[PDB]
Scaffold this active site. Structure first.
Site, PDB file in Angstrom:
ATOM      1  N   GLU A 165      58.484  93.672 -32.072  1.00  0.00           N
ATOM      2  CA  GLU A 165      59.451  94.427 -31.326  1.00  0.00           C
ATOM      3  C   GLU A 165      60.226  95.231 -32.356  1.00  0.00           C
ATOM      4  OE1 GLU A 165      59.181  95.363 -28.487  1.00  0.00           O
ATOM      5  OE2 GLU A 165      58.168  93.885 -27.179  1.00  0.00           O
ATOM      6  N   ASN A 211      62.066 104.864 -23.751  1.00  0.00           N
ATOM      7  CA  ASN A 211      60.778 104.555 -22.926  1.00  0.00           C
ATOM      8  C   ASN A 211      60.382 105.830 -22.138  1.00  0.00           C
ATOM      9  OD1 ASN A 211      61.992 101.696 -22.686  1.00  0.00           O
ATOM     10  ND2 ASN A 211      60.096 102.175 -23.827  1.00  0.00           N
ATOM     11  N   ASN A 243      64.988  95.856 -22.198  1.00  0.00           N
ATOM     12  CA  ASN A 243      65.022  96.996 -21.522  1.00  0.00           C
ATOM     13  C   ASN A 243      66.186  97.242 -20.674  1.00  0.00           C
ATOM     14  OD1 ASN A 243      63.680  98.888 -19.025  1.00  0.00           O
ATOM     15  ND2 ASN A 243      63.111  99.442 -21.162  1.00  0.00           N
ATOM     16  N   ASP A 263      65.098 100.440 -24.910  1.00  0.00           N
ATOM     17  CA  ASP A 263      64.848  99.179 -25.410  1.00  0.00           C
ATOM     18  C   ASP A 263      65.804  98.920 -26.715  1.00  0.00           C
ATOM     19  OD1 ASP A 263      62.413  98.590 -23.785  1.00  0.00           O
ATOM     20  OD2 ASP A 263      61.275  99.155 -25.267  1.00  0.00           O
ATOM     21  N   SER A 273      64.524 104.781 -19.574  1.00  0.00           N
ATOM     22  CA  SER A 273      65.120 103.490 -19.959  1.00  0.00           C
ATOM     23  C   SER A 273      64.970 103.225 -21.792  1.00  0.00           C
ATOM     24  CB  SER A 273      64.534 102.231 -19.415  1.00  0.00           C
ATOM     25  OG  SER A 273      63.068 101.979 -19.952  1.00  0.00           O
ATOM     26  N   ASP A 308      60.070 106.438 -18.992  1.00  0.00           N
ATOM     27  CA  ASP A 308      60.803 106.446 -17.761  1.00  0.00           C
ATOM     28  C   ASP A 308      62.248 106.519 -17.999  1.00  0.00           C
ATOM     29  OD1 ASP A 308      61.871 103.971 -18.823  1.00  0.00           O
ATOM     30  OD2 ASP A 308      61.111 102.802 -17.062  1.00  0.00           O
TER      31      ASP A 308
END
Ligand code: CL
Ligand code: NA
Length: 129
Positions: free
Chosen positions: A35, A46, A59, A52, A50, A48
């Site tokens: 990660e 991301n 998220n 992380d 969002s 969308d």
């Protein structure tokens, strides 16, 4: 903060992740490796909209508030910035909620793709735990 492998394993163990929901410490260290490469400050946008955040790339759509993810929740009741701290307490507390949400560690796509079914004990090998 960029943790050492065994340094992170020790911190995750102290915070109660070692066999949390049946996931051994090596699973958690493997997930963090792919990660964030053990960097608490890691952020990734991301598709969308969002983002992380932190060592386990938590998220903003469900888990933390960053003020710029429309329609989102904050189920860990924290600012997403709290997940970038050198102190991993907020990330661990929020990871415990995520892994309990029903799909276990499959919530982390990188864990499913790069850690699941592998010799995850290698990630804690040599560490004084
Ligand atoms: Cl599970
Ligand atoms: Na949010």
């Amino acid at each position: 903060k960029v943790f050492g492998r065994c340094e992170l394993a020790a911190a995750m163990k102290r915070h109660g992740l070692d066999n949390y929901r049946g996931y051994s410490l090596g699973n958690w260290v493997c997930a963090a490796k792919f990660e964030s490469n053990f960097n608490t400050q890691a952020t990734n946008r991301n598709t969308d909209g969002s983002t992380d955040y932190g060592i386990l790339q938590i998220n903003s759509r469900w888990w933390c508030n960053d003020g710029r993810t429309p329609g989102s929740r904050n189920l860990c009741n924290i600012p997403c910035s709290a997940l970038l701290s050198s102190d991993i307490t907020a990330s661990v507390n929020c990871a415990k909620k995520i892994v309990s949400d029903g799909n276990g560690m499959n919530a982390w796509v990188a864990w499913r793709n790069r850690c699941k079914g592998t010799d995850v004990q290698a990630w804690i090998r040599g560490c004084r735990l």
